[PDB]
Amino acid sequence: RFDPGTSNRNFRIAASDFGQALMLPRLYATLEETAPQVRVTGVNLRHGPLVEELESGSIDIAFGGFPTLSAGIKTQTLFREEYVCVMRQSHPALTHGLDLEAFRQCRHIIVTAHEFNHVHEQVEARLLELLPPESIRFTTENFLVSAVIAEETDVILTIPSRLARWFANRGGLTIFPVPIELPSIEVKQYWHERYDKDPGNIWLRRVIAKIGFQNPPAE
Amino acid sequence: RFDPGTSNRNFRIAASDFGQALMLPRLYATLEETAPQVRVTGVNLRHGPLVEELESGSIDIAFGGFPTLSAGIKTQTLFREEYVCVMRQSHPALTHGLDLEAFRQCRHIIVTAHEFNHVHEQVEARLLELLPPESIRFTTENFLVSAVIAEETDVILTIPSRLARWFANRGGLTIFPVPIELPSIEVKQYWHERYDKDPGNIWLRRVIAKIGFQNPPAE
Numbered sequence A, B: 001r002f003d004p005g006t007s008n009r010n011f012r013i014a015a016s017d018f019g020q021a022l023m024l025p026r027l028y029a030t031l032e033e034t035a036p037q038v039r040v041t042g043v044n045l046r047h048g049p050l051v052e053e054l055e056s057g058s059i060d061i062a063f064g065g066f067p068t069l070s071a072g073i074k075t076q077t078l079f080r081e082e083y084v085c086v087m088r089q090s091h092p093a094l095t096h097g098l099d100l101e102a103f104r105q106c107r108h109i110i111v112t113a114h115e116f117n118h119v120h121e122q123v124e125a126r127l128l129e130l131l132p133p134e135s136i137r138f139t140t141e142n143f144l145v146s147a148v149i150a151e152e153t154d155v156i157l158t159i160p161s162r163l164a165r166w167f168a169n170r171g172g173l174t175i176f177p178v179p180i181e182l183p184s185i186e187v188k189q190y191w192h193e194r195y196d197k198d199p200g201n202i203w204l205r206r207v208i209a210k211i212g213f214q215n216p217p218a219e
């Protein structure tokens, strides 16, 4: 039996750093108003098979796009996302703009996700195919790290538009279209069928389904 | 064995997400001007022994504070850091003040570092000791994630002052002293003695030793 109003359960959500930054603030009001002793922990993605973390209960929900989670896994598709490019407000390419070749000759920072089997790996692969190897100056596993490096140096960064907009709304980056075609991605929450009937998991699942991920955090 | 002006070597630096965000932008000018094909990859901290990653050449340099790195390891202490608290400018306790009692009754997000054996674990331990368990609403392994969440919710975040001051520029955090006695920490670069004589490693270490970590990134 799980009662949100009195529980002190610590829920663990596996997600990229941006996924955590997107999710947790949108849980705050719900926690404050209805589950004041419930704790939520964001857990970084690891190389091991995520399905086993979900099966054992060491992760309650995975939040992201995880193409290799299937067998033994239930899902709810939360939203669809598209990629854009960002550069800092004082980037010298802004004076005359970029055609596709000038883009390829700029310096880039890449977020790598193939080691975590996160759907961003599809974009990573396309960028690695597109770009001259010497054009790639930085690599990182974390989205927020790459965004703040783009604010402080002349590197181009290709990222989900929700992440881009968060920084653009604060003044630090400007957004422009990716000059090649990239897939859109589906972001979902995932749980193991072993916990499909668990009252705590069900509660968190349903809370997440109520979240508006295109809007500011409530309250 | 190594010439920076022509090298296409990919150096891997292990660090917290803030450490990566601190380090890489401060390498950019050096790379642009003296080593245009050298790539730098920020690598997240992991639960396994970091000494083995340095030993195997899997990581070139570790950057941060790692109290369990010793046998087989050479270090250079780069700077000392102290902690502060941040809260968003629209947080209620802003006016009241942040006395210890009011601090304890606020909601907190804690950056957990003990699993990575990073020196922030010392501050983590002090907070967990003083705060009631119901005061801790969120946990994350990522400093930048926690800063985004503090910017967007009424949680209090206790962090290195260099992260706080820089992060408070955009968006709107207010910095407070922590009403707890906290140690300062030493930030160092770490390498394995096996690569003490590797010319590529030597070059990168000396570049790092010339960085002003108290100043903005060059350019």
Ligand SMILES: Oc1c(Cl)cc(Cl)cc1Cl
Pocket: A015, A016, A018, A019, A020, A022, A063, A064, A065, A081, A120, A143, A160, A162, A163, A187
């Ligand atoms: O991991 C992600 C999540 Cl959960 C959401 C978005 Cl929009 C992007 C990423 Cl990379």
Ligand SMILES: Oc1c(Cl)cc(Cl)cc1Cl
Pocket: B015, B016, B018, B019, B020, B022, B063, B064, B065, B081, B120, B143, B160, B162, B163, B187
């Ligand atoms: O990992 C860190 C580094 Cl490398 C530098 C500072 Cl100032 C703080 C942290 Cl948490």
